[PDB]
Design a binder for this molecule. Structure first.
Ligand SMILES: [Mg+2]
Ligand SMILES: [Zn+2]
Lengths: 134, 161, 52, 196, 190
RNA sequence: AUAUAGACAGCAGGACGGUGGCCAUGGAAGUCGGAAUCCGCUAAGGAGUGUGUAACAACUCACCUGCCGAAUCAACUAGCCC
């Protein structure tokens, strides 16, 4: 595995942080990124989203790329700054979309009340877009 | 032997983790009783020994001497097993007959020492004298009179300074 | 040094027990009421505190 | 809530057994919820799997047996942690895939191990700060290139014995393949037929 | 409330026989004879058949406290059967942190000497109950084996050994040293 | 109130995915705190009753299932006794 691997996740986002962040505390696990690694990771991780932004990174032995899983609350807080049905319909297209599913409506039922932080009348009597995604 | 291995393993892992590796200039720094960086005994009674001394005395029983003991120590210590009945070394935990074999380290270092320990603690004069003759332990006056723990200290000092 | 299974065996008799809050009696770990009259067989029990 | 749950369950069982004519009864060993999700995803494409209460199973297949005969001969055989997989495919195609998709279960503490495994003499590949478990178990390990090496073959586990916590955590950190088990077919039922 | 009748039946194996002398039960099996009287309990004991040897314990017009005694008598009789057929063996382990506990088994296993408990110079002499034999196990390095026919005698002897090695004036959650009953089982495993 | 659509108690498993859910952040990832209680797999699972890990982790509970085959559980109340 190239003698070192970067499977570990992060829970930092929004402000750059750097020294205030725990990235120097992760540092001794791999010794590769250090400050010149977490700064350049945060450079691409400034947005998508502007929140805690739990995300995974992949190491190329010199630089890191970052992929942010499509967390429901993360993406809805990124969207926020009403129904807004279409944006939550389209936000689930690029996710992992497993959710122990049996139909496409399960994911939108999940996110409709994940937005509850009332978005429950739709959950009660929804009759739209049951097979929209497939 | 297990306690000695625990301590040796602890030393090796501590230096390996908290210092430079073998690729560093100092090279292989992790200790080995087979190499001779590990010593035993007690400074309270003034007796100490390494694998080197017992390997030397066993080669003497059985340049050239240094080359013999250098690779003799590699069998003196390790997870190797010597059968007192067979009279030769073995690398297998199970004997052809089925009897469990003692390890080489215990069987031909700690076993004569435990014989002299038991003899001198239980006051077996015949055992102590015969072990002295079998190990050519040199003793002087005022030391050949005592028996017990002081004689244990004296014999350990004289046989294994 | 004590190996973990022997430590567990010792702790079964020495540490894994209940204490009555009223009369400090040492009770079996599944106790609900104290076995002693002087506290009135009370059900105010607590775990025996650990060395941790 | 409970009564409606049981009634809906009865309706589901009767409609499923009417819909699917071929079903294999399959025992569930010490299997996890992750394995349940994996089997559900890997099997929901072509067939369905059912794993609930045995009393529910016997009552559903006994009380409402009048709709089709040649079913009561399952009754003296549905015992233990067992369920029904309903399929329209055939026995070999179900059996080979279900015997192939076995997740390599680890060595959970407190679990019996009828199978036998033995650690070989090879480098661990981890840092030399985990010698405590090896020394507690009684394993001779020495430093080599900054990694822990097993210098001698030792007996790890026998058949039909309890697994200690130290052994379980050793097999957890060793990243090796321990004894494993999963959902195993007990027998079959194809329109009133019992085979292996 | 007075219950009219509370009865419980104990089956007797073929290799062991039971004789009643009033409320005194004499159980003779391959390993010996265990005799115990229950004259402190007002029950009726009867042997039922010449075929399978059932022993019935009956209590008539008993309240709750004396209904509790029927299964006590039955369990005692079952323990007697178990003792005379398979025997009772208690395995104890001596645990210590620094000072090894040296155990010496004196004549015929009837006396146990504990030497170095917590490093003190006192010698603990514990005398086993009659019919109980103590021994030092050859399978484990620190293990006592107490074997006998009477479960109460064997367990009382084990309790004496356990209570002799008691840490005093120290934190017992830290000073875990002593001899503890590791397991309870039978001899002959049959 | 539960229970042959098999209670209760014991013994044995699962107790998840999104999600190491959001705002709290220096780790709080289910449990130092503020809000809300989603969905699906279903046999069930609280985006958590507790232990605890610096934190991970590893346990436990409520929830279901297996063995077990007949009744059981809870909260009160008031007589004597303590
Ligand atoms: Mg004090
Ligand atoms: Zn009390």
């Amino acid at each position: 595995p190239n003698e070192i691997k970067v499977v570990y996740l992060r829970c930092t986002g929004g402000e750059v942080g750097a020294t205030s962040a725990l990235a120097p505390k992760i540092g001794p696990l791999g010794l590769s990124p250090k400050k010149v690694g977490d700064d350049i990771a945060k450079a691409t991780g400034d947005w998508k989203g502007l929140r805690i932004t739990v995300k995974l990174t992949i190491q190329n032995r010199q630089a890191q790329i970052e992929v942010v899983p499509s967390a429901s609350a993360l993406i809805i807080k990124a969207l926020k700054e009403i129904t807004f049905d279409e944006i939550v319909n389209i936000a689930r297209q690029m996710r992992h979309r497993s959710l122990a599913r049996e139909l496409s409506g399960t994911i939108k039922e999940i996110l409709g009340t994940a937005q509850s932080v009332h978005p429950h009348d739709i959950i009660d009597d929804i009759n739209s877009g049951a097979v929209e995604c497939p | 032997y297990q306690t000695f291995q625990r301590i040796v393993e602890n030393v090796n892992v501590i230096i390996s983790t908290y210092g430079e590796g073998e690729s560093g200039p100092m090279g292989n720094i992790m200790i080995d009783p087979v190499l001779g960086t590990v010593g035993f005994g007690s400074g309270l009674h003034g007796w100490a020994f390494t694998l080197k001394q017992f390997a030397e005395m066993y080669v003497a029983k059985f340049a050239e001497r240094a080359k013999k003991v250098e690779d003799m120590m590699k069998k003196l210590w390790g997870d190797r097993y010597f059968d007192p009945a067979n009279g030769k070394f073995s690398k297998s935990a199970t004997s052809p007959e089925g009897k469990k074999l003692p390890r080489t380290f215990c069987q031909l270092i700690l076993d004569p020492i435990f014989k002299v320990f038991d003899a001198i603690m239980n006051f077996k004069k015949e055992e102590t004298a015969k072990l002295i003759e079998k190990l050519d332990i040199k003793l002087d006056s005022e030391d050949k009179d005592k028996e017990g723990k002081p004689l244990l200290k004296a014999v350990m000092r004289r046989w294994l300074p | 040094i004590i190996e973990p299974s022997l430590r567990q065996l010792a702790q079964k008799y020495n540490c894994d027990k209940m204490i009555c809050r009223k009369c400090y009696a040492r009770l079996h770990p599944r106790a609900v009421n104290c076995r002693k009259k002087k506290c009135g067989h009370t059900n105010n029990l607590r775990p025996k505190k650990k060395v941790k | 809530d409970r009564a409606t749950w049981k009634s809906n369950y009865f309706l589901k069982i009767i409609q499923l057994l009417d819909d699917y004519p071929k079903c294999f009864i399959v025992g569930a060993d010490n299997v996890g919820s992750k394995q349940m999700q994996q089997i559900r995803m890997s099997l929901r494409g072509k067939a369905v799997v059912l794993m609930g209460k045995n009393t529910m199973m016997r009552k559903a297949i006994r009380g409402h047996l009048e709709n089709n005969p040649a079913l009561e001969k399952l009754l003296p055989h549905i015992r233990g942690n067992v369920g029904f997989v309903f399929t329209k495919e055939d026995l070999t195609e179900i059996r080979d895939m279900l015997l192939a998709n076995k997740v390599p279960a680890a060595a959970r503490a407190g679990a019996i191990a009828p199978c036998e495994v033995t650690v070989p003499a090879q480098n661990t590949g981890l840092g030399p700060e985990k010698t405590s478990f090896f020394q507690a178990l009684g394993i001779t390990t020495k430093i080599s290139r900054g990694t822990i090496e097993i210098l001698s073959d030792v007996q790890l586990i026998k058949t039909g014995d309890k697994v200690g916590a130290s052994e379980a955590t050793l097999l957890n950190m060793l990243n090796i393949s321990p004894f494993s088990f999963g959902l195993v077919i007990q027998q079959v039922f194809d329109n009133g037929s019992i085979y292996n | 409330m007075k219950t009219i009748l509370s009865n419980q039946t104990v089956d007797i194996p073929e290799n062991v026989d039971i004789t009643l002398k009033g409320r005194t039960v004499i159980v003779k099996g391959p390993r010996g004879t265990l005799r115990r009287d229950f004259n402190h309990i007002n029950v009726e004991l009867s042997l039922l058949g010449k075929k399978k040897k059932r022993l019935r314990v009956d209590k008539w017009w008993g309240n709750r406290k004396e209904l509790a005694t029927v299964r006590t008598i039955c369990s005692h009789v079952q323990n007697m059967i178990k003792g005379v057929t398979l025997g009772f063996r208690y395995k104890m382990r001596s645990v210590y942190a620094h000072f090894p506990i040296n155990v010496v088994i004196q004549e015929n296993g009837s006396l146990v000497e504990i030497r170095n408990f917590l490093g003190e110079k006192y010698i603990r002499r514990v005398r086993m109950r009659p019919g109980v034999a103590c021994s030092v196990s050859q399978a484990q390095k620190d293990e006592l084996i107490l074997e006998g026919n009477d479960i109460e005698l064997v367990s009382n002897s084990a309790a004496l050994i356990q209570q002799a090695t008691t840490v005093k004036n120290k934190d017992i959650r830290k000073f875990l040293d002593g001899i503890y009953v590791s397991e309870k089982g039978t001899v002959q495993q049959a």
